[PDB]
Structure 1
């Protein structure tokens, strides 16, 4: 996250870290046994780490559970990143309390102007790299689809939305991928892509979760 602030330990209880020997992507806990992340974060041998603040220190609230299965969206296109969403089922259910909790899926899509919370352990610099050990947060508004398509001509589909600052300076970045974009207590987006990080007129693009609720619900019900 570039230009954000330190969230504070366990203040984002649905945030998960996907680990394959190291942290490589974020995700969101939607119920005790399922996590949603970005399809581009797919790989085999994933361990989901919940209750984390410092990913390099066991502080006491962590739950490390391996994934039993991953399901990438049937129409995921890795060249365009259209339908960039995946579901991960945990081998056992996590124990939910105040520091580890699930986030609700949305009943309606959010509108441009809505302020959201984006979090993750990704890069904090727009040029160069510096990866934080504790969770960073950023409050950003969803931008109009017109502004979004104008910043990324020929690249935004109906399954994507932009959120951020056209002026630059504040944005999600590499390492934040798969993480949550929560607006009014509902999961509205997943950190997907962008041109660089925090660059002027190149806001972050996010998977529009409201368009996948039926797929999520039907998949969980049958697996």
Structure 2
């Protein structure tokens, strides 16, 4: 997260760290046995880490749970990043509490100007790599489709939206991928891609989760 603020420990209880010996992606807990992340975060050997603040220190409230399966959207396209979403099933159900909790799926898509909360443990600088220990937070609005498509002509599908600041200086970045964009208490986005981080006129692009709710529900029901 570039230009954000320290969330505070366990203030974002649905936030997850995907770990393979190191943090590589975020995710969101959507019930006690399933996580939503980005398709481009796919790998084998994923451990899900719940209840984290400092990812480098065991502080209490952590639960480490292996992924038993990862389900990349079958129409995910690695070139265009269309359908950049993946479901992860936990080996065992998480123990839900004040500090470990699920986030609701949306019943409707969010409109432009909706202010959202984006969080993660990714890079906090644009040019240069500085990773935080603790979870960072950023408040950012959803941009209009017209502004999104003028920023990234020809690259924006109906399954994507832009959020952030055209003036720059505030954005998600490397390591934030697959993390949550939560607006009015519902999961509306997944950190997917962008052009650098926090560059002027290059806002972040996010998977539009409201387009996948039935897929999510049908997939979880059958697995």
When normalised by structure 1's length, the TM-score is: 1.00
Structure 1 position 74, deviation (Å) = 1.1
- Map residues 1-223 of structure 1 onto 2, 5 A cutoff: 1-223=1-223
1:15-41, Cα deviation, whole Å (9 max, x unpaired): 000001100000000000000000000
Cα distance in 2 for residues equivalent to 1:59 and 1:6: 17
Structure 1 position 73, deviation (Å) = 0.3
Structure 1 position 101, deviation (Å) = 0.2
Cα distance in 2 for residues equivalent to 1:21 and 1:124: 21
Secondary structure at the aligned position of 1:88 is classed as strand
1:200-220, Cα deviation, whole Å (9 max, x unpaired): 000000000000000000001
1:173-195, Cα deviation, whole Å (9 max, x unpaired): 00000000000000000000000
1:64-122, Cα deviation, whole Å (9 max, x unpaired): 00001000001000000000000000000000011000000000000000000000000
Cα distance in 1 for residues equivalent to 2:76 and 2:34: 19
Cα distance in 2 for residues equivalent to 1:174 and 1:111: 26
Structure 1 position 142, deviation (Å) = 0.1
Cα distance in 1 for residues equivalent to 2:128 and 2:51: 29
1:132-183, Cα deviation, whole Å (9 max, x unpaired): 0100000000000000000000000000000000000000000000000000
| Structure 1 stretches of 4+ moved >3 Å | none
Secondary structure at the aligned position of 1:64 is classed as strand
Cα distance in 2 for residues equivalent to 1:140 and 1:3: 11
Give the total of aligned pairs.
223
When normalised by structure 2's length, the TM-score is: 1.00
Structure 1 position 63, deviation (Å) = 0.3
